[PDB]
Design a binder for this molecule. Structure first.
Ligand SMILES: NC(=O)C1=CN([C@@H]2O[C@H](COP(=O)(O)OP(=O)(O)OC[C@H]3O[C@@H](n4cnc5c(N)ncnc54)[C@H](OP(=O)(O)O)[C@@H]3O)[C@@H](O)[C@H]2O)C=CC1
Ligand SMILES: CCc1nc(N)nc(N)c1C#CCc1cc(OC)ccc1OC
Length: 157
């Protein structure tokens, strides 16, 4: 399976200044559970802002950097190398990845952040007429999770 995993806001903001604009541990928990024991594919900037691979799953970084050789990370230099990755593969971002991959994925796991944030990076426009809602679960608003959010699993129609 080839999936997208993204958190985006009402205006499809995904990032600001190489960081996430909001702080939503529920969504981190959702990522962890969904991708633990599987593969995350991310662009180099996303990797460099995380700072280290996420534990208990294969971390794959896409970069044109021929000197890239990070401990605990696998590197690919071409989009086409994604299709050779075995198992359940999640396109983990950021913007360039989502743009290159939106038309190829089976499937998208989207956390809709029900707010409008200052952003400099975006999820591409998509229509609910190409995508069927397999599940829509309202996130629990919280002490520690203070923005309304909805977990979507969408499957290509
Ligand atoms: N809300 C969310 O779910 C997520 C948010 N983000 C956010 O997104 C932002 C980063 O997004 P963005 O700036 O687009 O960057 P990316 O993380 O997508 O990284 C861009 C880099 O990835 C590499 N790359 C992409 N495509 C190719 C290709 N076809 N061949 C070779 N290398 C390639 C290049 O690295 P190189 O220059 O080394 O060649 C490129 O410059 C940050 O703000 C981050 O916080 C990221 C993921 C999820
Ligand atoms: C955890 C944020 C997130 N949620 C969903 N649903 N999908 C995603 N692809 C992401 C992401 C991301 C990149 C990222 C994660 C992070 O937490 C460990 C810290 C920084 C990040 O990039 C700046």
């Amino acid at each position: 399976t080839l999936s997208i995993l993204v958190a985006h806001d009402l205006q499809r903001v995904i990032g600001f200044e190489n960081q996430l604009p909001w702080h939503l541990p529920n969504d981190l928990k959702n990522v962890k559970k969904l991708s633990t024991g599987h593969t995350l594919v991310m662009g180099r900037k996303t990797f460099e802002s995380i700072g280290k691979p996420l534990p208990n799953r294969r971390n794959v970084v896409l970069t044109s950097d021929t000197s890239f050789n990070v401990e605990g990370v696998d590197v690919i230099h071409s989009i086409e190398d994604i299709y050779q990755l075995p198992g359940h593969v999640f396109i983990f971002g950021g913007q360039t990845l989502y743009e290159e991959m939106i038309d190829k994925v089976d499937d998208m796991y989207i956390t809709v952040i029900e707010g409008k944030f200052r952003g400099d990076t975006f999820f591409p426009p998509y229509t609910f007429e190409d995508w069927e809602v397999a599940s829509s679960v309202e996130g629990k608003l919280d002490e520690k999770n203070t923005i309304p959010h909805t977990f979507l699993h969408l499957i290509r129609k």
